Design a protein around this ligand. Structure first.
Ligand SMILES: *[C@@H]1O[C@H](CO)[C@@H](O[C@@H]2O[C@H](CO)[C@@H](O)[C@H](O)[C@H]2NC(C)=O)[C@H](O)[C@H]1NC(C)=O
Ligand SMILES: *[C@@H]1O[C@H](CO)[C@@H](O[C@@H]2O[C@H](CO)[C@@H](O)[C@H](O)[C@H]2NC(C)=O)[C@H](O)[C@H]1NC(C)=O
Ligand SMILES: *[C@@H]1O[C@H](CO)[C@@H](O[C@@H]2O[C@H](CO)[C@@H](O)[C@H](O)[C@H]2NC(C)=O)[C@H](O)[C@H]1NC(C)=O
Ligand SMILES: *[C@@H]1O[C@H](CO)[C@@H](O[C@@H]2O[C@H](CO)[C@@H](O)[C@H](O)[C@H]2NC(C)=O)[C@H](O)[C@H]1NC(C)=O
Lengths: 89, 107
């Protein structure tokens, strides 16, 4: 808005993009990868993590025997991101 | 990458200044609800499915493949065992019928 220059607003508002990501995140948390293929089919998140361990080659019992430890690692790892973002410039 | 759904195959077709792919994909439909559990406690051992999941239509437990509901009885040749079942959360008690015991009991 100075002399002949205008900045057009993006079609998708920031709130709409946040809603998109929230939808994707809820889908991946609740239904695993089924929602991308088609109808969203829900699996308990532990069993889905077991699916994914089978995907990377580790057998699924490894998750169930170690589910609490894996949960703690994931929670602390997410916690580290907050420090990294808030403090590191 | 190639269509929405699990990719089966795809065919090319010539276009004037480009190419048109016909992507043949498999889309699951007509889903059904089931009760589920990670393991099965039997004789103090935890049985996990080899490939598939444990599904129950309320009162009977089965093994199915994850993408097409084709139920089969829980048996020792399609579920493996890993330790006892005090560590798993979500265990359900049920019988894991083994195929050698009926043949041996016929003796
Ligand atoms: C699996 O069960 C869930 C829960 O019973 C179903 O979700 C509900 O279905 C009813 C009837 O269609 C709706 O009125 C509710 O709004 C649904 N959501 C709830 C209760 O949170 C789900 O439809 C079932 N899936 C199939 C394929 O039948
Ligand atoms: C859950 O599935 C089981 C599958 O075994 C059903 O049990 C059998 O159902 C058939 C068909 O009705 C009967 O002929 C059998 O006698 C039943 N028992 C056995 C041991 O095979 C069971 O009825 C289903 N339950 C519900 C609520 O659908
Ligand atoms: C799945 O969630 C249910 C929630 O109802 C668990 O059953 C118990 O439900 C009562 C209802 O008041 C809660 O107070 C308990 O805390 C629940 N138990 C637990 C261990 O959370 C059920 O146990 C859960 N299943 C699994 C495998 O965790
Ligand atoms: C599956 O079977 C086991 C074996 O009996 C059950 O464990 C019993 O639980 C009761 C109540 O907690 C105890 O009084 C018994 O001492 C336990 N038995 C053994 C051998 O430890 C278990 O409760 C069963 N699963 C369910 C869901 O009832």
């Amino acid at each position: 808005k100075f002399n002949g220059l205008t900045v057009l607003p993006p079609l998708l508002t920031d709130e709409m993009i946040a809603q998109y990501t929230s939808a994707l995140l809820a889908g991946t948390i609740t239904s695993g990868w089924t929602f991308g293929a088609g109808a969203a089919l829900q699996i308990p998140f532990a069993m889905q993590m077991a699916y994914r361990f089978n995907g990377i080659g580790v057998t699924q019992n490894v998750l169930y025997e170690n589910q609490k430890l894996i949960a703690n690692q994931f929670n602390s790892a997410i916690g580290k991101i907050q420090d990294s973002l808030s403090s590191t410039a | 990458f190639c269509g929405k759904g699990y990719h089966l195959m795809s065919f090319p077709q010539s276009a004037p200044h480009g190419v048109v792919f016909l992507h043949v994909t498999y889309v699951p439909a007509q889903e059904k609800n089931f009760t589920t559990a990670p393991a099965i406690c039997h004789d103090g051992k935890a049985h996990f499915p080899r490939e598939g999941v444990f599904v129950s239509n309320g009162t009977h437990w089965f093994v199915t493949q994850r993408n097409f509901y084709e139920p089969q009885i829980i048996t020792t040749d399609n579920t493996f065992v890993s330790g006892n079942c005090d560590v798993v959360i979500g265990i359900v008690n049920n019988t894991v019928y083994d195929p050698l015991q009926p043949e041996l009991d016929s003796f």
